[PDB]
Every structure is written in C-alpha cells, then in structure tokens.
Amino acid sequence: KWHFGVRCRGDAPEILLAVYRALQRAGAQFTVPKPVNSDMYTIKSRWEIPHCKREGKNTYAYIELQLYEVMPGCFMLDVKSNGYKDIYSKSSFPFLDLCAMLVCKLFSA
C-alpha cells in the first residue's frame, strides 16, 4: 500500500501541465523550464505557509517536485521537502500539510 509520491498515468507533459495547474491553484510559485536555445520535470515550488501569513510572518516552505517514468505510460510524481524559511533570522509539518493541499488540487482538476 505505502509508496513514494503520487501515482499518475498518461502523457509526459500532460501530467506536467496537470502538476503546473495544481500548483497555481494552491498559490505556490514555481520554476519554469528553460529551453536550451529533460529537467523540465524538476519543479522547485515556493509555498506561503498559511499559519504564518495570517499571523504576519513571511515564512515560506520549499518543495521540489520530480516526475519519473515507472513503466511505459505510468509515472510517479515524487515530492521532496527542502525545509522552511523566514525572511529574518527538521519537521514534517507544514510539509505534509501542504502535500495534502497539492494532492487535493491534483485530484480535483
């Protein structure tokens, strides 16, 4: 039953677009493929942590997303955490809480 990231099947950049549109909806900002005049499936999203925003803090959470082929037609959207960060100067939350957000978004397109 337990397996990394979120399963997805279909067309290479059709899920990548799914994954882009889902990111917009949550608010998270994201990096964009730089065409060379494959890494386009490596997205670095910067999410605003809502339990900080509404308090006033500008602390963000940083989530890289990776897509892999698992077998022909079948893919995994891996989702890693690169920690959290304030503007001025570990744990699985808000990270798990935001994967919750993203996954809800992916599923309701």
Binding site: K1, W2, H3, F4, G5, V6, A12, P13, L16, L17, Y20, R21, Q24, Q29, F30, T31, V32, P33, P35, S38, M40, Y41, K44, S45, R46, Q66, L67, Y68, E69, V70, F75, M76, D78, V79, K80, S81, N82, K90, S91, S92, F95, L96, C99, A100, V103, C104, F107
Partner: protein, 85 residues
C-alpha cells in the same frame, strides 16, 4: 526565480518532440512503512529518502500521507490521516 504564471509552451499541443523524464530509480521502489519487522519500530530509514512524501490508499475516504524525518539522532516517520474537503 519563482514564477506564478502557468507556462505557455504546454498550451499550444504535441509541440516539439518533448524531452522524456527520468525513470524511477531503485531507491524509491520500497517504502519502509511496508514492514512488520513494539509495532512502532521501523527499519533504519535511508539517508536519501528523508523528507520524501509517501502515500497509501485507505478504502476510507481519507488521504494517508507520510515523511520520515530526523530528530537529533533518531528518526521519526510520521503517518498522516486527513480528509479531502
């Protein structure tokens, strides 16, 4: 370096014969939560998997989410049961 607008090239369809994503490496094949190896004790977590999302179906209408994460020198894999709305 972060953008809020959805990237254009995707919209308009099968555009250039686009570059393929990488295949799944053996490291993300096996998730330690598949283990009855005290039934909270887990196998030592991988060095590299730390901070990677894991998911499972519940048959119950909820999302099950987990990550393993370090805490000082011991490891905490934490499983989340949570609604959709």
């Amino acid at each position: 370096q972060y953008s809020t607008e959805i990237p254009a090239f995707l919209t308009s369809l099968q555009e250039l014969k686009l570059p393929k994503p990488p295949s799944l490496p053996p490291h993300l094949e096996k998730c330690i939560l598949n283990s009855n190896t005290d039934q909270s004790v887990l196998p030592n977590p991988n060095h590299v998997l730390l901070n990677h999302l894991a998911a499972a179906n519940t048959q119950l209408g909820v999302l099950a989410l987990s990550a393993t994460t370090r805490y000082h020198r011991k490891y905490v894999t934490t499983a989340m049961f949570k609604n959709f709305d």
